[PDB]
Amino acid sequence: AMAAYLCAPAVIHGEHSVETREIVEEVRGRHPHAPWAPRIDGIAASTGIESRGWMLPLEAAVAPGGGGDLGAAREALEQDANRAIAALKAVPASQTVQERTAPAWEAVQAYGERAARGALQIAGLDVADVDCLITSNSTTPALPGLDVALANRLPLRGDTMLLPATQWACVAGTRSLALAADLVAADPDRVVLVVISEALSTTYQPADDTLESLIVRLLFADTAVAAVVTGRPRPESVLRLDAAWHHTLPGTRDLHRLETRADGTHFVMDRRGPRAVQETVTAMWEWLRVRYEDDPSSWHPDVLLAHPGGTRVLEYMEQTMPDEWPSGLLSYSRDSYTSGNRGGAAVFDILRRAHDAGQKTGSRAVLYAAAPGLTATALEGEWL
């Protein structure tokens, strides 16, 4: 029913390495008097992250944006009034949404373009071979978006099928593979290119004050990844997708939200979020079990590329695994998190780390990812 082939992904991390000590040090500087103050060495140490890559330097986020009409305020309120307006402008203002977005939107296009070309080289293809383009980009408001940018820069054929998304977030790594599978099913001669470019650092907001704000600042890293899916096997084909699985939890939309305020984009996380995704992990084990119910006990997942959102739920996955399964399945996933949470680009990154480590032809593979709204998508496959 479902047959789709996947060449190895191309991963391109953020060039601006931001030390976790630089963030801890920076936020301490931002808010001197705070209740979370003692929690810092404690909270930061639990992440297990020394440093991450960004598409922009920490300065690009923390810096003051300023900019305000002022003249209208001055007029509405002679020489004494001018000194008053200058006294108000001197105060450092946060960056407006367009100020945070502009440079990030540029980085996204650039990193995405690189990853796109990388993906095509790995597949051994030409830019003109691409028939359908799928893009995923969440934290940098743009219309037209990454898809039209790519079709211009690569470039792609004028008749390429453009399929941009912005609300997939963390599930892009599996939802786009599931989608690509369907496209190459409608036409096996199709060449689908998936590009996930995320400047997640756009969520780093210096002003916010929360036990969770610190966690949002420390969690995410920037990346652009890409991969080719085809309806017919290629020597460059690394993995074959056999089934897709979707699961959405009713009444959990507000656990992970991305709010777009006048000062950029905010990612608010409810403490029960992980607990909610644990549900989708159970749902998945059940999916796999029911699918290998008739089949002999021989069937067994040799590779697990999972993206629950954190090490915590990763630990939970290791303990929920049926009977006796290999211990180092979440090795690649865990290795990925130590560099940061790459959201929509996480799955590919993990697939890359798995690939770069060396896999055996025939290895049973499972790709998994959970995302805001609390919806998840899993794929079962076979390594080639």
Add this chain to the structure above:
Amino acid sequence: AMAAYLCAPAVIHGEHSVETREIVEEVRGRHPHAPWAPRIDGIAASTGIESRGWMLPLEAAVAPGGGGDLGAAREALEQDANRAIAALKAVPASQTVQERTAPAWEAVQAYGERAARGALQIAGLDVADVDCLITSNSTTPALPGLDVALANRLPLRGDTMLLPATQWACVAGTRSLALAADLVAADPDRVVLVVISEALSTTYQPADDTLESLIVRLLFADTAVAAVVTGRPRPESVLRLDAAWHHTLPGTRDLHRLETRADGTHFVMDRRGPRAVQETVTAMWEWLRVRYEDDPSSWHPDVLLAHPGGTRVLEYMEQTMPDEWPSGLLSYSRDSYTSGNRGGAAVFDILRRAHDAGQKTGSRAVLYAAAPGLTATALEGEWL
């Protein structure tokens, strides 16, 4: 190669009717001294629009949002300082992006939910029959978006395939039909539900000053539409899709843009935009011609559901039509524009007006739409 069946669309306009005289009158009030002032009765009269429907009242856009820390500014600058801050707060501030979005996001979910249920009733289906959901929503930043909202409210099955988009804009009416076609091709038993919900009035910005600003205020209307596509014909099936066509113009990304500023969403239009879409209309005539080149001259489009973006390019379409073709093809399209430009919801709305008017089984149909970035998607079909 491509076989997809489409039940009649459900259209649900904005309940808040805004008279064009109310907008003309309002903007005159906003900007007393202006160069465009004499152009008003002239410019507004060319639109051919008496009034439009909105998901919110004109007041919801024009109203002042206010809201500002203030305390920090006061502290940074006793009783005299307090009177100064109160003197600054008295000035009417524009609404912040979250203030413009919040109520619109609510209207979008509601109108979309209604149109979704309507679409399912027209198809004679149950909410649990839906296998894939496609949503399109451009002017109201939300993550999770309309897709998860719908899966909760309808509700849909936990395993429904969610496919949300926000950057499709005006092309959603054809890009989602093309996409739906591919999905039901991968699995003909599939039931795809498309929902396009747009609060385009979110772009109405009282402050902006441009010959084009007036045009942006006067052009768009709010709508939520929905339709069911299946891989197998149903008694409710109204139209059958046979082919899909895509076309993107290189180096034209900046003609129609949607910028997300701190005070909401802005839609900037370059004067050469229509001239650019004329290109895609030619490209399309050529597509159809090349496709009916071998076939006898008998082949002839009996229904033309087109959405170039305005009456101007509509006139151009009427004059570019090969040989002798029926005069009232753009009748339904033109009828649609007199009520406003519904963007992504335009095509369905036009398909509805065509349907409500009565069509003959066998009528050759063509669906067309152009959208920002300057990309277009056309579909050729046969009425049932």
